[PDB]
Amino acid sequence: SGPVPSRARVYTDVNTHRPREYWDYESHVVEWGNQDDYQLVRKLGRGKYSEVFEAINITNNEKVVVKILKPVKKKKIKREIKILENLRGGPNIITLADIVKDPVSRTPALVFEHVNNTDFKQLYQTLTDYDIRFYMYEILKALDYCHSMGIMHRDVKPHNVMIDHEHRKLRLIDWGLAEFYHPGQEYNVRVASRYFKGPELLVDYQMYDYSLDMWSLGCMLASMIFRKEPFFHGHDNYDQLVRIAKVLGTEDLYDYIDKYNIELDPRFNDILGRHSRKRWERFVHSENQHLVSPEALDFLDKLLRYDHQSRLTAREAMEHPYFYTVVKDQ
């Protein structure tokens, strides 16, 4: 036995065709700028792996964002830098402007282009059906691009999506968990926030690909159209799969596990039970109905599949009827 192998349906060999240096980030030599070019203005936030500041480049008086890294292995910093450099200039990808080190503490800091993000509590109540379709399309452009460039984001969620609503501008941020896709590679399943983890992660299927990001995206879409954040609210990684199973149903889950010859943890056998596949109609109510259409539900259904191979690709998703008005306007 052991699990059945898997390959991405698209962009399978994009890294194989690149020079090794493109993806072999362990070999990457970091280009350091001058720390003294930046003065910190104010703290913006703190994350698992960093503290984020607004700063000013005193050479040209530009506003920038500085992410000062907490201690991480040099290869993980190299990976994030290499990915940001490879993706620089791509649609809706955050722009890495510079990389500096404090010469005393030796702490490394990434310097980004400044994006004026719109406060969540003011965005949430104003967003129309059109706005959701528009911003979803913008995220898909970033995902198609990074996938086409041989990179999985692996941490798609609202915290990692900046919107400057005034400028109708979106950026996908926090490439610290992203990885290069190589056919045959077994990845770490301990990635992404619980609520956004794909079934492949939860059942410990390591040979995953770009399609992980499409599950995460579907989770985001569900939370936005149904006004339920998070959508799949698990207590832990095990219960997370139970919450998914109560919606997608257990029949399809067991079909997926059979197809890939996945060995399910003994714990899971007790708690999965038997669940019907639910209709999306049970999440619709008077408050959210203006966001919910046949198109939205058809699209959502085609993202949220157990079987990573059957999810829409980014480029397929962009062709879905949910986006016809957006595509016409652009």
Ligand X SMILES: O=S(=O)(c1ccc2ncsc2c1)N1CCC(CCNCc2ccc(-c3ccccc3)c(Cl)c2)CC1
Q: 78: annotated binding-site residue?
A: no
Identity of the amino acid at 217: L
Long-range contacts of 98-103 (CB under 8 A, 24+ apart): 98/33, 98/37, 98/38, 98/64, 99/30, 99/31, 99/32, 99/33, 100/32, 100/33, 100/34, 100/35, 100/37, 100/38, 101/32, 101/35, 102/35, 103/35
Instruction: Based on the residue annotation, tell me whether 155 is a catalytic residue of this protein.
Output: yes
**What is the DSSP code (8-state) at residue 93?**
B
The residue (of 180 and 299) whose beta carbon lies closer to Na ion is 180
Site membership for ligand X, residue 326 (CB under 6 A)? no
Structure tokens at 162: 């900046």
Out of 10, 68, 132, 207, the only residue in the binding site for ligand X (CB under 6 A) is 132
- Find out whether 218 and 300 touch, Cβ atoms under 8 Å: yes
Q: How far apart are CA 79 and CA 176, in angstroms?
A: 8
Instruction: Report the site for ligand X in 153-172 (rule: CB under 6 A).
Output: 158-159, 161-163
Q: Which partner, Na ion, ligand X, none, binds residue 244 by CB below 5 to 8 Å per kind? A: none
- Identify the active-site residue in 98, 144, 155, 213: 155
Out of 146, 178, 189, 224, the only residue in the binding site for ligand X (CB under 6 A) is 224
Instruction: Report the site for ligand X in 187-216 (rule: CB under 6 A).
Output: none
* Cis preceding-peptide flag for 230 (omega within 30 of 0): yes
Instruction: Report the site for ligand X in 30-49 (rule: CB under 6 A).
Output: 44-45
Instruction: Report the site for ligand X in 46-85 (rule: CB under 6 A).
Output: 52, 65, 67
Out of 52, 72, 207, 326, the only residue in the binding site for Na ion (CB under 5 A) is 207
Catalog residues that contact ligand X under the rule CB under 6 A.
44-45, 52, 65, 67, 94, 112, 115, 117, 120, 123-124, 132, 135-136, 158-159, 161-163, 173, 220, 224
Binding residues: 44-52, 67
